[PDB]
């Protein structure tokens, strides 16, 4: 029932290279969650 | 460019569709039963 | 609750559910109003 959310904002295809990304948010939600959809701004 | 993103199982208002975005003001989460557009976007 | 929660002709302010699709994943709620496919025949929007 978690949404846990996890960032990491790297300055530079994708590289070849290793960063970890830290825990951002931990999301109390609960509900069932099957498929999804990103946003853009016009 | 990319705002936010859209979760959920129908992505209607019959069950609870999980919304993230990140306007030019500050970071806003809401848990609703949204009726998404087939089309969403911002702009 | 028959203190608080009782109706001579029936507390009908509380509702329970019988004819889920499956069993549900733990920790997860379904809002459906439709009705449940008890059979063979599709409903089509057609109860009893």
Same mark, same amino acid.
């Given at each position: 029932? +978690?949404?846990?959310? +996890?960032?990491?904002?790297?300055?530079?295809?994708?590289?070849?290279?290793? #960063?970890?990304?830290?825990?951002?948010?931990?999301?109390?939600?609960?509900?069932? *969650?099957?498929?999804?959809?990103?946003?853009?701004?016009? | *460019? *990319?705002?936010?993103?859209?979760?959920?199982?129908?992505?209607?208002?019959?069950?609870?569709?999980?919304? *993230?975005?990140?306007?030019?003001?500050?970071?806003?989460?809401?848990?609703?039963?949204? &009726?998404?557009?087939?089309?969403?976007?911002?702009? | 609750?028959? =203190?608080?929660? #009782?109706?001579?002709?029936?507390? !009908?302010? +509380?509702?329970?559910?019988?004819?889920?699709?499956?069993?549900?994943?733990?920790?997860?709620?379904?809002?459906?109003?439709?009705? !449940? &496919?008890?059979?063979? =025949?599709?409903?089509?929007?057609?109860?009893?």
């Amino acid at each position: 029932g +978690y949404f846990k959310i +996890y960032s990491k904002h790297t300055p530079i295809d994708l590289p070849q290279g290793f #960063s970890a990304l830290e825990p951002l948010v931990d999301l109390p939600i609960g509900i069932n *969650i099957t498929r999804f959809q990103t946003l853009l701004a016009l | *460019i *990319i705002r936010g993103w859209i979760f959920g199982t129908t992505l209607d208002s019959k069950t609870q569709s999980l919304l *993230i975005v990140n306007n030019a003001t500050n970071v806003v989460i809401k848990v609703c039963e949204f &009726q998404f557009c087939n089309d969403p976007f911002l702009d | 609750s028959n =203190k608080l929660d #009782s109706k001579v002709s029936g507390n !009908y302010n +509380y509702l329970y559910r019988l004819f889920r699709k499956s069993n549900l994943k733990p920790f997860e709620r379904d809002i459906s109003t439709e009705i !449940y &496919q008890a059979g063979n =025949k599709p409903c089509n929007g057609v109860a009893g």
